[PDB]
Amino acid sequence: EVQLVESGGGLVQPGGSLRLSCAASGFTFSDYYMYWVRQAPGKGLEWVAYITKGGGSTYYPDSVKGRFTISRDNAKNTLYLQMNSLRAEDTAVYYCARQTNYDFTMDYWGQGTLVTVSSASTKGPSVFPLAPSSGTAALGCLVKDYFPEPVTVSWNSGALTSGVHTFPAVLQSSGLYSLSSVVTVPSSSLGTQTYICNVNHKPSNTKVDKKVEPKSC
């Protein structure tokens, strides 16, 4: 299988620098022209860097030229993007993309890495229970007051997926994100089945398992 894995995205001060990397596998890397394409939250696609097979030449749009440097290492299967003098509007998910052989389209993309340009501080969430009440019952975890994005939430270490909704984070007026993750389950299970939400906010090194149960009354 062809695979592209981006890494290196994170939170950086306005004016700072960051270097992204992309690991390629399952195809002969030096045979292919490569792209970096970025997507600001809720926005469209913008290519930001292009490099030839041997790395001999590089191309960038105006929005980025003079600040980004695309490079590659064909011996060790890796594409790079050096980003300097970062601005708030460089905040985006950055994708590594392979150019289709003998064409100009992009036929494989990585999963993307998020770059956040901000002076706000990193802060890990608190995790609070959304306890099932007095058929189908609903329960969840409230993942409150963190920065930057992203956080991941699983249930029962990934064993519970049906009926799960993890909501998009929303920025509070404090400048911190909050979100809830909920699941609907049989009411008959509430005494018997354990429900634990697994929260990981890697930017702040915050891992939490929260068991959620009916409140004693």
Partner: protein, 214 residues
Amino acid sequence: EIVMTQSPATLSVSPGERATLSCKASQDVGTSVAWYQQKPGQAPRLLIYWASARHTGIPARFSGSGSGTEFTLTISSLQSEDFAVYYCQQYSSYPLTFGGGTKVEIKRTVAAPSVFIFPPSDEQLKSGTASVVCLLNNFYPREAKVQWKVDNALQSGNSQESVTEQDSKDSTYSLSSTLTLSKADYEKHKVYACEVTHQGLSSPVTKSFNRGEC
């Protein structure tokens, strides 16, 4: 640069019916135009190249047409898994450019939300803040009204909503509304209520609790 413009920013099409998407170029780009599908949370996927050639492994219900400055993506029998943003792209000349995307929603039948209210946890209250959460689960269409009342006073400006992306499997939405008060304010009031107005409900549904009661 050549500007690509995608005409209906949004489309809402019943499952099994035809969806037609438009992409217009500012200059001639021949047939050097591609289409990408991007589902929420995922990277784009190449659908069509050369204006009308289906990429390998793409289902036959996707077809592309056009030449010059006017291009069209047709999904002949829209399936629920086709919920996505669709982007066009020209590669006729440097620099390559993308259109702004068209978001295709599946217009399923009306589904009323299941509504749940959650009081703030005792652990959060120690922090000095109270979050009250109202959940609307698995409804269609997306339009819904959620109103918070605290001892009969409509609360405005002190809540935020989040809505999931349309569910690929059942084509529904879910919604959370979070009311945030100080602990001091929370403990000054008794009746907390979420009232939900939605097309699938014959009249609004209220879920409520009394602070300190069970």
